[PDB]
Symmetry: C3
Subunit: 230 residues, 3 copies
Amino acid sequence: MMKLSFHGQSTIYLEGNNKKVIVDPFISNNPKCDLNIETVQVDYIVLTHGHFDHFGDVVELAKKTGATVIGSAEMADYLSSYHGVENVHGMNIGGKANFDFGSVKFVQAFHSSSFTHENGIPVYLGMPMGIVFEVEGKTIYHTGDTGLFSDMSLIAKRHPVDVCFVPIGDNFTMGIDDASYAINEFIKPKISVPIHYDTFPLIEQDPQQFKDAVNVGDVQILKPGESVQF
Amino acid sequence: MMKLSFHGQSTIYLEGNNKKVIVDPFISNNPKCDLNIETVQVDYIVLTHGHFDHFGDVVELAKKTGATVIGSAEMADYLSSYHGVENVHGMNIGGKANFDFGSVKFVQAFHSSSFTHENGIPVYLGMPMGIVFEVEGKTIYHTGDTGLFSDMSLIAKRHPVDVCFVPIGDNFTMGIDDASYAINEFIKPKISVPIHYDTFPLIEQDPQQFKDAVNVGDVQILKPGESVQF
Amino acid sequence: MMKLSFHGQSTIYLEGNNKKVIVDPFISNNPKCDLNIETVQVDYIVLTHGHFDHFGDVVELAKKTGATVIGSAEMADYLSSYHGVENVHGMNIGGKANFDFGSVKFVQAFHSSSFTHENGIPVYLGMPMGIVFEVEGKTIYHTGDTGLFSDMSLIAKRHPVDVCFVPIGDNFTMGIDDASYAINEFIKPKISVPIHYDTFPLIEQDPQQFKDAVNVGDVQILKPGESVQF
Ligand SMILES: [Cl-]
Ligand code: NI
Ligand code: NI
Ligand code: NI
Ligand code: NI
Ligand code: NI
Ligand code: NI
């Protein structure tokens, strides 16, 4: 069974052909994240966007493991030239790349992508994105941080989805209503997993309300550390 | 009757539960704005995007009044860490937050969002946005600065609109044909108010051309200072 | 016959009412581009976004020719205030402007828009855009660098397209499958020209796979220097 686990906020982990992939590795500064910077093994890191709660420990993790960081062209240049990360792969929206683990395709999201420096100036890191993985015959749609958009149904029709990770926190993303609508109306995956809630007071939600509002496929409310059952 | 008035370019003012809310306060540097920084009373400032003709007097207005500034996460960081604004609430697209005035939900726009510093370098302030307010049983859709997009119909279906503020200036936003198509095809509000024209030579339009081309609901051509008649 | 030519990556050149317009002038540093910055004559330069492979020689080209640079508000601010470019016209998505050559209208794209200064800090230059030209009775849709989006069909239905320039390079934009779907399903132009391939190893594509996959209108595989046959 394909290995795919949730680890708090928008952090997911998966294996394809014995290669380890993490998304949005907010580990050391998320007390609800079950992962440890010291012990996690990865060959690749994929970033949906540059916000602190996704960017997280990418620099320290990339350096320690020698993992390749996949993201926007701006993100790749930033990690490379500002942070000195040796192994980066720049991409953009609609772009697909084949790696030894499987494929990464970046899709559109509605949000922002920046990392705020000490002077208070946000450093722009491209348009925010979602990820479509094809790994061991499974199609995984991580929506990233996003508002509701009708082209979610274009992404899902062109890439029928096994597992969708969808933010339900509200304030900074879709809340319960928009995220359930996204699943019911546009994505219709076999498995839905809600993400990006409870990490901060502002995004505390009852994921049961999400599960009650979803009428299509299976909803799996994964706590940090738990894996998707296929 | 709910208090809702236009003050030139994209500046709207409203009252909910006796709290005063201003959007995109371009006051001191807009000669056609009937408002004055010294006398304007506000509890909340909402910014659709960072451009000078929307950002306007937010810093000086926020310190004089102690008003809370609601905007993108980047806007909140920038205003707080760079300009030292005391009271900010960071949000992002698809996010909804409940205040004592009513609710504010950010939605997508197609435009840009930055404030250009002395040296010609823009500061990135997120993706540009529109606003859905629910205030005193009214749904208000300020589209912000945007081009035409079909998800205007999704925003409107999910949040049936009482008043829509829609830019008609062209060059920088929708002109007459697109704005009127947005109203007739996608949004279909009870009341349409054209905004973002005549302030500069480049965005001079006859709003009567807009009202002529709209076939749905009621078009109220408001001069700065004039309120919406419900 | 109206003059319209492809010069590698996303560089196009056209003439209307004896005025010369270039798009994304990446000349000096593209070895597959047949143009020479010393001999290139233009009255107008149009920028879809700020990536180096589009920005290209805009500053040197603009000063030598006195050409007006048309782009995003941010691009206009940046070229003017930072680079001292004399003649700029700021626009934004959905905005249309009439020139002696014909009309330019900016439309949305899904990509990023920056130019990187030292140490991997991007200068933000707005949302990335496509262009709708109306020149000597022809409608040209340059999609810019973009992923697939359904509003390609709104743009094409509101502005029926004679020539579409569409990226097929993949990784950083649509690849073969997405680009051919865009043409077949959404744009349906008289003529399709694939762009943004072969220039770098990462974006190497056989444009015959695109032509075989397109079922609507005529596909013209232009080598750098070749012109559209109407
Ligand atoms: Cl759409
Ligand atoms: Ni975020
Ligand atoms: Ni987030
Ligand atoms: Ni603006
Ligand atoms: Ni504006
Ligand atoms: Ni690009
Ligand atoms: Ni490019």
